[PDB]
């Protein structure tokens, strides 16, 4: 029989005003046989139209698999609101539903820390930039590095990790050449996140 | 005011 | 039919001499009906003795879980060797087959550099002192903080994190009261890795 | 020589 999965938006496309956020409802192990898929999409239980079907796709294991897109408004999604689909066919006795929405809980600002490379670090071939974002809620963010308006993508970002108070932290390393650091160069540690002014903030690091 | 991330349009309070 | 998983041992029984590593092949899904299950452990090839079954456990969904431990030497572990457990069961077609061991990969010594507080969080009611361990190789790793000598548990550590070097790298913060740290007071991040000297390296931090 | 945490024996080379 098929599965269906859920998924919420993009960050970025939540908290950027120039971008549109979509909620996903996948359909796997739809069969050769019977592919018509029919689905019912609701927020907050009010039924909704504006749904787009994706181009069905055959995945080469005796399966298809079934797309449909729904496009969400910034502060439907911000304001916790459910987006439910249900999903019908032939092959399944009873529609299956899942429900998805952003994570329940008072969102709390980041505290966004740049910290410089150690003292003994400035031995090695290139130094490593850190940037702790620490307290926010929920763990929906992006994290992004950038010098003189240009972005630098040599970063690695762990993971949320949550905090004994019940906020998430993470930290963000950017790894660049002694020299750079040593010139005076300035460095950015740019953040989104919906309980910011404007989801936005940026942190500078140099000397 | 308005915040922007590499010259795109973020958010406007 | 029953279905078998296989644990390496901790990170650091297998970095302390004073401590003793062990693999644990874990059985669940036995069944009332035929509760006897047979162990076959091997480490390269050769079949070995020494392993004990834990004392059986009923799980209350209808089931069983039969536990064995295999002790492993320090060095044997180390070096890359192969634990093979081998599961038979009455309702089981064939036996089932897992095998475990160190993860492949020349090691590399981690690099741990201690980060004290952004002056910008003295505005805060407790500070966060980050300390870094990066250029790692494997994960398997163990990372605690102390003071005075006496161990400090106010701390998170994030996952390792796979850096664009094929090494790993990792974060951990400490979050103590601004007033201890304005003192004066020396803390300490204690790591333990397989390429350390000695398995053992300490990295302190004071104002 | 050898290193100790919190009192625990690690490892002597
Ligand atoms: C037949 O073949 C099918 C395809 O197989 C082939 O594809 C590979 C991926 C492999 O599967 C390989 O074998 C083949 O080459 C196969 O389908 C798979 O079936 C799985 C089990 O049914 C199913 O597992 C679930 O996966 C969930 C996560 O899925 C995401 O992440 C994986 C990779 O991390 C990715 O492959 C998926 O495509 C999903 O990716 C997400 O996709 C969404 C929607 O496109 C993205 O979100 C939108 O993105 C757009 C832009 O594209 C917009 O931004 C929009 O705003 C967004 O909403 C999202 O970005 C993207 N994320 C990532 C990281 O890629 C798990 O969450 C799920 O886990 C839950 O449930 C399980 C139980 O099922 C529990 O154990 C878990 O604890 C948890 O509760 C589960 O693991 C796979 O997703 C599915 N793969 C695909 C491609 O559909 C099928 O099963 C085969 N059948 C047979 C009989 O052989
Ligand atoms: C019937 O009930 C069974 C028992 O379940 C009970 O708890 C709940 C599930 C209740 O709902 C209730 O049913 C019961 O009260 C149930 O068994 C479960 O079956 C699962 C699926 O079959 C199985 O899932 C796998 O889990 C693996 C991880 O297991 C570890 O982590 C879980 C969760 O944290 C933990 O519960 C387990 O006990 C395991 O914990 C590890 O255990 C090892 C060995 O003891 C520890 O290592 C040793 O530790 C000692 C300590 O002194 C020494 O240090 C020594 O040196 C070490 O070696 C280790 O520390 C400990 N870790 C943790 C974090 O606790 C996954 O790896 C596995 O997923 C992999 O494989 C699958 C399939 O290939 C993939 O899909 C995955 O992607 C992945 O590759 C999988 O998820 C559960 O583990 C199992 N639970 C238990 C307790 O055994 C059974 O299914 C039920 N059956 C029915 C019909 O209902």
């Not at chain 2, 005011?1 to 795109?8: F, I, P, Q, R």
Request: include cysteine.
């Amino acid at each position: 029989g098929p599965s269906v999965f859920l998924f919420p938006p993009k960050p970025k496309d939540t908290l950027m005003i120039s971008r549109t956020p979509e909620v996903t409802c996948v359909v796997v192990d739809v069969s050769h046989e019977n592919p018509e898929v029919k689905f019912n999409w609701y927020v907050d239980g009010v039924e909704v139209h504006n749904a787009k079907t994706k181009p069905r796709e055959e995945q080469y294991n005796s399966t298809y698999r079934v797309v449909s897109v729904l496009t969400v408004l910034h502060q439907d999604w911000l304001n916790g609101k459910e987006y439910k689909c249900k999903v019908s066919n032939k092959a399944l006795p009873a529609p299956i539903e899942k429900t998805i929405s952003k994570a329940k809980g008072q969102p709390r600002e980041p505290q966004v820390y740049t910290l410089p490379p150690s003292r003994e670090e400035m031995t090695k071939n290139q130094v490593s930039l850190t940037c702790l974002v620490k307290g926010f809620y929920p763990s929906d963010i992006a994290v992004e590095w950038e010098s003189n308006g240009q972005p630098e993508n040599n970063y690695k970002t762990t993971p949320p990790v949550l905090d004994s108070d019940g906020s998430f932290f993470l930290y963000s390393k950017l790894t660049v050449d002694k020299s750079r650091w040593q010139q005076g160069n300035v460095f950015s540690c740019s953040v989104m996140h919906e309980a910011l002014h404007n989801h936005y903030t940026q942190k500078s690091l140099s000397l | 005011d308005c915040a922007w991330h590499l010259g795109e349009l973020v958010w406007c309070t």
